[PDB]
Amino acid sequence: TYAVKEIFYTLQGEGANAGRPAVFCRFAGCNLWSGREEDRAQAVCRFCDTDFVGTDGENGGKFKDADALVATIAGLWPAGEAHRFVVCTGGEPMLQLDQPLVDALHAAGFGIAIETNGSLPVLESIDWICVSPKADAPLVVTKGNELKVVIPQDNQRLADYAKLDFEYFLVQPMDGPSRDLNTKLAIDWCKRHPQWRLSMQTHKYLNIP
Amino acid sequence: TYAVKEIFYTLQGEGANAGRPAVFCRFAGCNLWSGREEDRAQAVCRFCDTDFVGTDGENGGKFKDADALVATIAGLWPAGEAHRFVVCTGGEPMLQLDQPLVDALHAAGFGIAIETNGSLPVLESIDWICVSPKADAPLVVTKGNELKVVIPQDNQRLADYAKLDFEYFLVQPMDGPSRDLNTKLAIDWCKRHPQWRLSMQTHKYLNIP
Ligand SMILES: C[S@@+](CC[C@H](N)C(=O)[O-])C[C@H]1O[C@@H](n2cnc3c(N)ncnc32)[C@H](O)[C@@H]1O
Ligand SMILES: C[S@@+](CC[C@H](N)C(=O)[O-])C[C@H]1O[C@@H](n2cnc3c(N)ncnc32)[C@H](O)[C@@H]1O
Ligand SMILES: Nc1nc2c(c(=O)[nH]1)N[C@@H](C(=O)O)CN2
Ligand SMILES: Nc1nc2c(c(=O)[nH]1)N[C@@H](C(=O)O)CN2
Ligand code: SF4
Ligand code: SF4
Ligand SMILES: [Mn+2]
Ligand SMILES: [Mn+2]
Ligand SMILES: [Mn+2]
Ligand SMILES: [Mn+2]
C-alpha cells in the first residue's frame, strides 16, 4: 500500500539527468521532517522547499497495490512513445518504495530513478540512484550514481563526500532568501574543486512543475 | 599555428556536461559565417550569439605551436587539481584543431570536448563530440556523443536527427527576441518526444562567462 502526494509529467529539473522528460512520483512523508511548519525549526532537515504532506495533490492518493500505481504513472506518458522514465521522490521515497513496485515499473518499460536523502538503505535494482546527504542525518548509502549535495549547510564536511563511490558529484545551491548567494558559492566551489559539478534547479528558472 | 579568440575558465553551460568546470578555447573564424553583421543576413548560419572575429579577447592571440596553446590552457586550471577538461569551440574549431594539439592536450592530462556544427569531419580521438546541426548546411558528422540541435530553424527535419548514431539527443532554445517563446517550444517538443532532452544555456541564467 502506497501513499502519494502527487504524480505529474515534466522535465527533470535537477542533477545529471536535468532536461530529461520524466514522470515524477512524489511519495508522501519524510523521515527527517514531519512536513509541518511548526516543526521545521527543530527538524533534522530544515531547508526543504517541498510540500509532501498528504495525498491531496494532482493525481495523488492512497493506492491499492503496485499495479494500481503503475497504471497511473504509465498513463501520463505520451502514447506510442518509448524511453519511459520515472523519478521516485517525496518526501523520502525509501519509506515506501519496495521491490514489487520496482519490478512492476520495470515490467512496464520504465527506467527508475530515485531522489533519496541517504539516511535509508536503498534497492540496488533501481537504475539511477541520486543521494542528497543531509548534514545532521546519518549517511548509510555510500555508493550510487550521483551524489547531489545541497550547499551550504552547517556541520557540512564537503570534501569527504568526494571520497565516496559515485559517478557524479554535484553541489546544488540552497533555495531560500539567499539563493543568489548560495549559487555563487556553488560556482566557486566547483571552479576550485573541478571534481564537482553545478546542479541548478532549472525548473524554477523555466517556471515549470 | 592557431588563431584563438579567447581562452577562459568557467562552467560548461550547455549540453550533457552542463555545470561541469572547463577551460574554453574559443577558436577564431567559422565556415558558415564570416562573423561580421553585414554578412549575417546572407550567411549559411544566421543565428549565432557569439563573437569569434579576431584574436583580441581574453588570453586571445596567435599561437606559435601546439605547446604554446596548451601552456596557456593548463595555466588557467586550478593548481594541484585533476579532472582536467577543455571545451574546444569557436567559431568552428575543426578549422584549426588538429592531431598534434589533441595529443598535446591529452599528454597534459586534459579530457577534450568539442562544440562543432557538423559540416567538417572530426578527429575521432576527441573524448566528447558535440554536434549542432545547422539546417541549411551539410551534415558530414553523423556519429558522436551528443547531438545538440538549436530550434526552431526553418527547413529543419527534427525527427530525422533522432535516427543518427548519438548517445544524447538535446534541443536547445534559440536565443534572441523569442528566447522565452522558443523555450516553451523546446520543452513541449521533449515532452511529446521524450527521446529528446532539454538543453538550457544555463550560463546566461547564472550570468557567468
Ligand atoms: C525534496 S527532496 C525529496 C527526496 C529526499 N527527501 C532528498 O532529500 O533527497 C528532492 C531534492 O531537492 C533538494 N532540495 C530540497 N529543498 C531544497 C532547497 N531549499 N534548495 C535546494 N535543493 C533543495 C533535496 O536536497 C533533494 O536533492
Ligand atoms: C557558437 S557555436 C560554436 C561551435 C560551432 N560553430 C557550432 O555551431 O556548433 C557554440 C554552440 O552555441 C550554439 N548557439 C549559437 N548561437 C545560438 C543561439 N542564438 N541560441 C542558442 N544556441 C546558440 C550553437 O548551436 C553551438 O551548439
Ligand atoms: N521538475 C522538477 N524536478 C525536480 C523537483 C521539482 O519540484 N520539479 N524537485 C526535486 C524532487 O522533487 O525530487 C528534484 N527534481
Ligand atoms: N559557459 C559557456 N558554455 C557555453 C558557451 C558559452 O558562451 N559559455 N557557448 C557555447 C560554446 O561557445 O561552445 C556552449 N557552451
Ligand atoms: S529529507 Fe528531502 S523530503 Fe525530507 S525535508 Fe529534507 S529535503 Fe525535504
Ligand atoms: S556554425 Fe557555430 S560558430 Fe559558426 S555562425 Fe553558426 S553558431 Fe556561430
Ligand atoms: Mn522539488
Ligand atoms: Mn502544496
Ligand atoms: Mn556560446
Ligand atoms: Mn566580443
Coordinates of C-alpha atoms and ligand atoms in Angstrom, one line a residue:
Chain A
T1 CA 0.0 0.0 0.0
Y2 CA 1.4 3.4 -1.1
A3 CA 0.6 7.0 -0.1
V4 CA 1.4 9.5 -2.8
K5 CA 1.4 13.3 -2.7
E6 CA 1.2 14.0 -6.4
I7 CA 2.1 12.4 -9.8
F8 CA 2.9 14.6 -12.8
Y9 CA 4.7 14.6 -16.1
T10 CA 7.5 17.1 -16.8
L11 CA 11.3 17.5 -17.3
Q12 CA 13.7 16.6 -14.6
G13 CA 15.0 19.9 -13.3
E14 CA 18.0 18.8 -11.3
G15 CA 21.1 16.6 -11.4
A16 CA 22.8 14.8 -14.2
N17 CA 19.5 14.0 -15.9
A18 CA 18.4 17.6 -16.0
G19 CA 16.2 18.4 -19.1
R20 CA 15.2 14.7 -19.5
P21 CA 11.4 14.1 -19.7
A22 CA 10.1 12.0 -16.7
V23 CA 7.1 11.2 -14.7
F24 CA 7.5 12.4 -11.1
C25 CA 6.1 10.2 -8.4
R26 CA 6.2 12.2 -5.2
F27 CA 5.6 9.9 -2.2
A28 CA 4.2 11.4 1.0
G29 CA 6.0 11.6 4.3
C30 CA 9.7 12.0 5.2
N31 CA 11.8 10.6 8.0
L32 CA 13.8 13.9 8.5
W33 CA 10.9 16.3 8.8
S34 CA 7.2 15.9 9.7
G35 CA 6.3 18.4 7.0
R36 CA 4.5 20.9 9.3
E37 CA 6.0 24.4 9.5
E38 CA 5.8 24.4 13.3
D39 CA 8.3 21.5 13.4
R40 CA 10.7 22.9 10.8
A41 CA 12.8 24.9 13.2
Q42 CA 13.7 21.8 15.2
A43 CA 13.9 19.2 12.4
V44 CA 16.9 17.2 11.2
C45 CA 16.3 18.6 7.7
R46 CA 15.2 22.3 7.9
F47 CA 15.6 23.7 4.4
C48 CA 13.0 21.7 2.4
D49 CA 11.3 23.6 -0.5
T50 CA 8.7 20.9 -1.0
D51 CA 5.1 20.1 0.2
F52 CA 5.0 16.3 0.7
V53 CA 2.2 16.4 3.3
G54 CA -0.9 14.3 2.5
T55 CA -2.3 12.8 -0.7
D56 CA -4.4 15.7 -1.9
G57 CA -2.2 16.7 -4.8
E58 CA -2.5 16.3 -8.6
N59 CA -3.1 12.6 -9.3
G60 CA -2.3 11.9 -5.6
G61 CA -4.0 9.4 -3.4
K62 CA -3.7 6.1 -1.5
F63 CA -3.0 3.3 -3.9
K64 CA -4.4 -0.3 -3.8
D65 CA -1.2 -2.1 -4.8
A66 CA 1.8 -1.8 -7.2
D67 CA -0.2 -2.4 -10.4
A68 CA -2.6 0.3 -9.5
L69 CA 0.1 2.9 -9.0
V70 CA 1.9 1.9 -12.2
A71 CA -1.3 2.3 -14.2
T72 CA -1.5 6.0 -13.2
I73 CA 2.2 6.5 -14.0
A74 CA 2.2 4.8 -17.3
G75 CA -1.0 6.7 -18.2
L76 CA 0.8 10.1 -18.0
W77 CA 3.4 9.1 -20.6
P78 CA 2.8 10.2 -24.2
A79 CA 1.1 7.5 -26.2
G80 CA 3.2 5.4 -28.5
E81 CA 6.5 6.9 -27.2
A82 CA 9.2 4.9 -25.5
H83 CA 12.2 6.0 -23.3
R84 CA 9.9 5.7 -20.3
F85 CA 11.4 7.2 -17.1
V86 CA 10.1 7.7 -13.7
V87 CA 11.6 9.7 -10.8
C88 CA 10.6 8.5 -7.4
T89 CA 10.8 11.3 -4.9
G90 CA 8.9 12.9 -2.0
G91 CA 9.2 13.2 0.8
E92 CA 11.5 10.3 1.4
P93 CA 10.7 7.6 -1.2
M94 CA 12.6 4.8 0.6
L95 CA 9.9 4.9 3.3
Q96 CA 7.6 3.2 0.8
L97 CA 9.4 2.1 -2.4
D98 CA 9.6 -1.7 -2.3
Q99 CA 10.9 -4.4 -4.7
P100 CA 7.5 -5.3 -6.1
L101 CA 6.9 -1.7 -7.2
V102 CA 10.3 -1.6 -8.8
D103 CA 9.5 -4.8 -10.6
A104 CA 6.1 -3.6 -11.8
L105 CA 7.7 -0.4 -13.2
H106 CA 10.5 -2.4 -14.9
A107 CA 7.8 -4.6 -16.4
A108 CA 6.0 -1.5 -17.8
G109 CA 9.2 -0.5 -19.7
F110 CA 10.2 2.2 -17.2
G111 CA 13.7 3.1 -16.1
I112 CA 13.6 4.1 -12.4
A113 CA 15.4 6.9 -10.8
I114 CA 15.2 7.9 -7.1
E115 CA 15.8 11.1 -5.1
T116 CA 16.8 10.0 -1.6
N117 CA 18.4 11.6 1.4
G118 CA 20.7 8.7 2.0
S119 CA 19.5 8.0 5.6
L120 CA 17.7 4.8 4.5
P121 CA 19.0 1.8 2.7
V122 CA 18.1 1.6 -1.0
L123 CA 17.2 -1.1 -3.5
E124 CA 20.1 -1.6 -5.9
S125 CA 17.8 -2.8 -8.7
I126 CA 17.0 0.9 -9.1
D127 CA 18.5 2.2 -12.4
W128 CA 19.6 5.7 -11.3
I129 CA 20.4 6.4 -7.6
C130 CA 20.6 10.0 -6.6
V131 CA 21.7 10.7 -3.0
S132 CA 21.4 14.2 -1.4
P133 CA 23.1 13.9 2.1
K134 CA 21.7 16.0 5.0
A135 CA 24.5 17.2 7.3
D136 CA 22.7 16.2 10.6
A137 CA 21.4 12.9 9.4
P138 CA 23.3 9.6 9.2
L139 CA 24.5 8.6 5.7
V140 CA 24.1 4.9 5.1
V141 CA 24.1 5.0 1.3
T142 CA 27.7 5.5 0.3
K143 CA 27.5 4.2 -3.3
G144 CA 25.3 5.2 -6.2
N145 CA 25.1 7.2 -9.5
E146 CA 25.1 10.8 -8.4
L147 CA 25.8 12.5 -5.1
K148 CA 23.9 15.8 -5.2
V149 CA 24.8 17.9 -2.2
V150 CA 22.8 21.0 -1.3
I151 CA 25.2 23.7 -0.1
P152 CA 25.7 25.4 2.2
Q153 CA 24.7 23.5 5.4
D154 CA 26.3 23.9 8.8
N155 CA 28.4 20.9 10.0
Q156 CA 28.9 20.0 6.4
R157 CA 32.0 18.0 5.5
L158 CA 32.0 18.6 1.8
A159 CA 35.5 17.3 0.8
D160 CA 34.8 14.0 2.5
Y161 CA 31.8 13.4 0.2
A162 CA 34.1 13.2 -2.7
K163 CA 35.7 10.1 -1.3
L164 CA 32.5 8.1 -1.8
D165 CA 31.7 5.7 -4.6
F166 CA 29.6 7.7 -7.0
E167 CA 29.9 8.5 -10.7
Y168 CA 28.8 12.2 -10.5
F169 CA 29.4 14.7 -7.7
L170 CA 27.2 17.7 -7.7
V171 CA 26.6 20.7 -5.5
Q172 CA 23.2 22.4 -5.6
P173 CA 22.5 25.9 -4.3
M174 CA 20.1 26.0 -1.4
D175 CA 17.0 27.8 -2.4
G176 CA 15.6 30.4 0.1
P177 CA 16.4 34.1 0.9
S178 CA 20.0 33.6 -0.2
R179 CA 19.7 31.6 -3.4
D180 CA 21.8 34.1 -5.3
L181 CA 24.5 34.0 -2.6
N182 CA 24.5 30.2 -2.5
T183 CA 24.7 30.0 -6.3
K184 CA 27.9 32.0 -6.4
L185 CA 29.3 29.7 -3.6
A186 CA 28.5 26.6 -5.5
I187 CA 30.0 28.0 -8.7
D188 CA 33.2 29.0 -6.8
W189 CA 33.3 25.5 -5.1
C190 CA 33.3 23.8 -8.5
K191 CA 35.9 26.0 -10.0
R192 CA 38.2 25.5 -7.0
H193 CA 37.4 21.7 -6.9
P194 CA 36.6 20.6 -10.5
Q195 CA 35.7 17.1 -9.4
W196 CA 32.4 18.7 -8.6
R197 CA 29.7 19.9 -10.9
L198 CA 26.9 22.5 -10.6
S199 CA 23.4 21.3 -10.3
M200 CA 20.9 24.0 -11.0
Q201 CA 17.2 23.8 -10.0
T202 CA 16.3 24.6 -13.7
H203 CA 12.6 24.0 -13.3
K204 CA 12.5 27.2 -11.1
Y205 CA 14.2 29.1 -14.0
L206 CA 11.9 27.8 -16.7
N207 CA 8.8 28.1 -14.4
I208 CA 7.7 24.6 -15.0
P209 CA 6.4 21.9 -12.5
Chain B
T1 CA 49.7 27.9 -36.0
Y2 CA 46.4 28.6 -34.2
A3 CA 44.2 31.7 -34.2
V4 CA 42.3 31.9 -30.9
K5 CA 39.7 34.5 -30.0
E6 CA 39.6 33.9 -26.2
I7 CA 40.6 31.4 -23.5
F8 CA 38.8 31.4 -20.2
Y9 CA 38.0 29.1 -17.2
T10 CA 34.3 28.6 -16.2
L11 CA 31.5 26.1 -16.2
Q12 CA 30.2 24.4 -19.3
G13 CA 26.8 26.0 -19.6
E14 CA 25.2 23.7 -22.2
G15 CA 24.6 20.1 -23.1
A16 CA 25.1 16.8 -21.1
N17 CA 28.1 18.3 -19.4
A18 CA 26.3 21.4 -18.2
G19 CA 27.6 22.6 -14.8
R20 CA 31.0 21.0 -15.3
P21 CA 34.1 23.1 -14.8
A22 CA 36.1 23.5 -18.1
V23 CA 38.6 25.7 -19.9
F24 CA 37.0 27.1 -23.0
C25 CA 39.3 27.6 -26.0
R26 CA 37.2 29.7 -28.5
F27 CA 38.9 29.5 -31.9
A28 CA 38.5 32.4 -34.3
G29 CA 36.6 32.1 -37.5
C30 CA 33.8 30.0 -38.9
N31 CA 33.0 28.4 -42.3
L32 CA 29.2 29.1 -42.1
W33 CA 29.6 32.8 -41.3
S34 CA 32.2 35.5 -41.8
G35 CA 31.5 36.9 -38.3
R36 CA 30.5 40.4 -39.5
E37 CA 27.0 41.7 -39.2
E38 CA 26.8 42.9 -42.8
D39 CA 27.1 39.2 -43.9
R40 CA 24.7 37.7 -41.3
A41 CA 21.6 38.2 -43.4
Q42 CA 23.0 36.1 -46.2
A43 CA 25.2 33.6 -44.3
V44 CA 24.6 29.9 -44.1
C45 CA 24.2 30.1 -40.3
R46 CA 22.3 33.2 -39.3
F47 CA 21.5 33.0 -35.5
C48 CA 25.0 33.0 -33.9
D49 CA 25.2 34.6 -30.4
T50 CA 29.0 34.6 -30.3
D51 CA 31.8 36.9 -31.3
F52 CA 34.5 34.8 -32.9
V53 CA 36.1 37.6 -35.1
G54 CA 39.7 38.3 -34.2
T55 CA 42.2 37.4 -31.5
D56 CA 41.7 40.4 -29.2
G57 CA 39.6 38.6 -26.5
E58 CA 40.8 37.4 -23.0
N59 CA 44.0 35.3 -23.4
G60 CA 43.5 35.5 -27.2
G61 CA 46.2 35.7 -29.8
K62 CA 48.1 33.7 -32.4
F63 CA 49.9 30.7 -31.1
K64 CA 53.3 29.6 -32.4
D65 CA 52.8 25.9 -31.9
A66 CA 50.6 23.4 -30.0
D67 CA 52.8 23.5 -26.9
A68 CA 52.3 27.3 -26.5
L69 CA 48.5 26.9 -26.6
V70 CA 48.4 24.0 -24.1
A71 CA 50.6 26.0 -21.7
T72 CA 48.0 28.8 -21.6
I73 CA 45.2 26.3 -21.3
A74 CA 46.8 24.4 -18.4
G75 CA 47.8 27.7 -16.7
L76 CA 44.1 28.5 -16.2
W77 CA 43.4 25.3 -14.3
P78 CA 43.4 25.3 -10.5
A79 CA 46.8 24.1 -9.2
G80 CA 47.2 20.6 -7.9
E81 CA 43.7 19.7 -9.2
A82 CA 42.9 16.9 -11.6
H83 CA 39.7 16.2 -13.8
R84 CA 41.3 18.5 -16.4
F85 CA 38.7 19.3 -19.2
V86 CA 38.8 21.6 -22.2
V87 CA 36.0 22.6 -24.5
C88 CA 37.2 23.5 -28.0
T89 CA 34.7 25.8 -29.6
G90 CA 34.6 29.0 -31.6
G91 CA 34.0 29.7 -34.3
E92 CA 34.2 26.4 -36.0
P93 CA 37.0 24.6 -34.1
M94 CA 37.6 21.9 -36.8
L95 CA 39.1 24.6 -39.0
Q96 CA 42.2 24.7 -36.8
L97 CA 42.0 21.8 -34.3
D98 CA 44.4 19.0 -35.4
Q99 CA 46.1 15.8 -34.1
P100 CA 49.2 17.5 -32.6
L101 CA 47.1 19.8 -30.4
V102 CA 44.8 16.9 -29.5
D103 CA 47.8 14.8 -28.5
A104 CA 49.5 17.6 -26.6
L105 CA 46.3 18.2 -24.6
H106 CA 45.9 14.6 -23.7
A107 CA 49.5 14.5 -22.7
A108 CA 48.8 17.3 -20.3
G109 CA 46.0 15.3 -18.7
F110 CA 43.2 17.2 -20.4
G111 CA 40.0 15.5 -21.5
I112 CA 38.9 17.1 -24.7
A113 CA 35.4 18.2 -25.8
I114 CA 34.4 19.9 -29.0
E115 CA 31.4 22.1 -30.0
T116 CA 31.1 21.7 -33.8
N117 CA 28.5 22.5 -36.4
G118 CA 28.9 19.1 -38.1
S119 CA 29.9 20.4 -41.6
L120 CA 33.5 19.3 -41.2
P121 CA 34.9 15.8 -40.4
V122 CA 36.0 15.5 -36.7
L123 CA 39.0 13.8 -35.1
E124 CA 37.6 10.6 -33.5
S125 CA 40.3 10.7 -30.8
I126 CA 38.3 13.6 -29.3
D127 CA 36.7 12.4 -26.0
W128 CA 33.5 14.3 -26.2
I129 CA 31.9 15.2 -29.6
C130 CA 29.0 17.6 -29.6
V131 CA 27.4 18.3 -32.9
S132 CA 24.9 21.1 -33.5
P133 CA 23.4 20.7 -37.0
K134 CA 22.7 23.8 -39.0
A135 CA 19.6 23.3 -41.1
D136 CA 20.9 24.9 -44.3
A137 CA 24.4 23.4 -44.1
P138 CA 25.7 20.0 -44.9
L139 CA 25.9 17.4 -42.1
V140 CA 29.0 15.2 -42.6
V141 CA 29.3 14.1 -39.0
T142 CA 26.6 11.6 -38.2
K143 CA 28.1 9.9 -35.1
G144 CA 29.3 11.3 -31.8
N145 CA 28.5 11.7 -28.2
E146 CA 25.7 14.3 -28.1
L147 CA 23.5 15.9 -30.8
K148 CA 22.5 19.4 -29.6
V149 CA 20.1 20.9 -32.1
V150 CA 19.1 24.6 -31.8
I151 CA 15.3 25.1 -32.5
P152 CA 13.5 26.5 -34.3
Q153 CA 15.3 26.7 -37.6
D154 CA 13.5 26.7 -41.0
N155 CA 13.8 23.7 -43.3
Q156 CA 14.5 21.7 -40.2
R157 CA 13.9 18.0 -40.2
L158 CA 13.9 17.4 -36.5
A159 CA 12.7 13.8 -36.1
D160 CA 15.2 12.7 -38.7
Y161 CA 18.0 13.7 -36.4
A162 CA 16.8 11.1 -33.8
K163 CA 17.9 8.3 -36.1
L164 CA 21.6 9.2 -36.1
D165 CA 24.3 7.4 -34.0
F166 CA 24.5 9.6 -30.9
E167 CA 24.1 8.9 -27.2
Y168 CA 22.3 12.1 -26.2
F169 CA 19.7 14.0 -28.2
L170 CA 19.2 17.5 -27.0
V171 CA 17.2 20.5 -28.2
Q172 CA 18.4 24.0 -27.3
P173 CA 16.2 27.1 -27.5
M174 CA 17.4 29.7 -30.0
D175 CA 18.4 32.8 -28.1
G176 CA 17.2 36.2 -29.5
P177 CA 13.9 38.2 -29.4
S178 CA 12.0 35.0 -28.9
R179 CA 14.0 33.1 -26.3
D180 CA 11.0 32.6 -23.9
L181 CA 8.9 31.6 -26.8
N182 CA 11.5 29.1 -28.2
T183 CA 12.0 27.7 -24.7
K184 CA 8.3 26.8 -24.4
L185 CA 8.6 25.1 -27.8
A186 CA 11.6 23.1 -26.8
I187 CA 10.0 21.9 -23.6
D188 CA 6.9 20.8 -25.4
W189 CA 9.0 19.0 -28.0
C190 CA 10.8 16.9 -25.4
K191 CA 7.5 16.1 -23.6
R192 CA 6.0 15.0 -26.9
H193 CA 9.1 13.1 -28.0
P194 CA 10.9 12.1 -24.8
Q195 CA 13.9 10.7 -26.6
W196 CA 15.0 14.3 -26.6
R197 CA 16.2 16.2 -23.6
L198 CA 16.2 20.0 -22.9
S199 CA 19.5 21.9 -23.1
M200 CA 19.5 25.3 -21.4
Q201 CA 22.1 28.0 -21.9
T202 CA 22.5 28.0 -18.1
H203 CA 25.4 30.4 -18.2
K204 CA 23.0 33.1 -19.3
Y205 CA 20.8 32.5 -16.3
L206 CA 23.7 32.4 -13.9
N207 CA 25.2 35.5 -15.7
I208 CA 28.7 33.9 -15.9
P209 CA 31.2 33.8 -18.8
Ligands
LIG1 C1 12.5 17.4 -1.8 S1 13.8 16.2 -1.9 C2 13.0 14.7 -1.9 C3 13.9 13.5 -1.8 C4 14.6 13.3 -0.5 N1 13.8 13.7 0.7 C5 16.0 14.0 -0.6 O1 16.2 15.0 0.3 O2 16.8 13.7 -1.5 C6 14.3 16.4 -3.6 C7 15.7 17.1 -3.8 O3 15.5 18.6 -3.6 C8 16.5 19.0 -2.8 N2 16.1 20.2 -2.1 C9 15.1 20.3 -1.1 N3 15.0 21.5 -0.6 C10 15.9 22.3 -1.3 C11 16.2 23.6 -1.2 N4 15.7 24.5 -0.4 N5 17.2 24.1 -2.1 C12 17.8 23.2 -2.9 N6 17.5 21.9 -3.1 C13 16.6 21.5 -2.2 C14 16.9 17.9 -1.9 O4 18.2 18.0 -1.4 C15 16.8 16.7 -2.9 O5 18.0 16.5 -3.6
LIG2 C1 28.9 29.4 -31.2 S1 28.8 27.7 -31.6 C2 30.5 27.3 -31.9 C3 30.7 25.8 -32.4 C4 30.1 25.6 -33.8 N1 30.3 26.8 -34.6 C5 28.6 25.1 -33.7 O1 27.8 25.9 -34.2 O2 28.4 24.1 -33.0 C6 28.5 27.0 -29.9 C7 27.1 26.5 -29.6 O3 26.2 27.5 -29.3 C8 25.0 27.3 -30.1 N2 24.4 28.6 -30.4 C9 24.9 29.6 -31.2 N3 24.1 30.6 -31.3 C10 23.0 30.2 -30.6 C11 21.7 30.9 -30.3 N4 21.4 32.1 -30.9 N5 20.9 30.3 -29.5 C12 21.2 29.1 -28.9 N6 22.3 28.4 -29.1 C13 23.1 29.0 -30.0 C14 25.5 26.5 -31.3 O4 24.4 25.8 -31.9 C15 26.5 25.6 -30.7 O5 26.0 24.4 -30.2
LIG3 N1 10.9 19.4 -12.3 C1 11.2 19.1 -11.1 N2 12.3 18.4 -10.8 C2 12.6 18.3 -9.5 C3 11.9 18.9 -8.5 C4 10.7 19.6 -8.7 O1 9.9 20.1 -7.9 N3 10.4 19.7 -10.1 N4 12.3 18.8 -7.1 C5 13.1 17.6 -6.8 C6 12.3 16.4 -6.4 O2 11.1 16.6 -6.1 O3 12.9 15.3 -6.4 C7 14.2 17.3 -7.9 N5 13.7 17.5 -9.3
LIG4 N1 29.8 28.7 -20.2 C1 29.6 28.7 -21.5 N2 29.3 27.5 -22.1 C2 29.0 27.6 -23.4 C3 29.0 28.7 -24.2 C4 29.3 30.0 -23.6 O1 29.4 31.1 -24.1 N3 29.6 29.8 -22.2 N4 28.6 28.8 -25.5 C5 28.8 27.6 -26.3 C6 30.3 27.5 -26.8 O2 30.9 28.5 -27.0 O3 30.7 26.3 -27.0 C7 28.4 26.3 -25.4 N5 28.8 26.3 -24.0
SF4_5 S1 14.9 14.9 3.6 FE1 14.3 15.6 1.5 S2 12.0 15.5 1.6 FE2 12.7 15.4 3.7 S3 12.6 17.5 4.4 FE3 14.7 17.2 3.7 S4 14.7 17.8 1.5 FE4 12.5 17.6 2.2
SF4_6 S1 28.4 27.5 -37.1 FE1 28.6 27.9 -34.9 S2 30.2 29.5 -34.8 FE2 29.5 29.4 -36.9 S3 27.9 31.1 -37.1 FE3 26.8 29.1 -36.6 S4 26.6 29.0 -34.4 FE4 28.2 30.6 -34.8
MN7 MN 11.3 19.7 -5.6
MN8 MN 1.3 22.3 -1.9
MN9 MN 28.2 30.5 -26.5
MN10 MN 33.4 40.3 -28.2

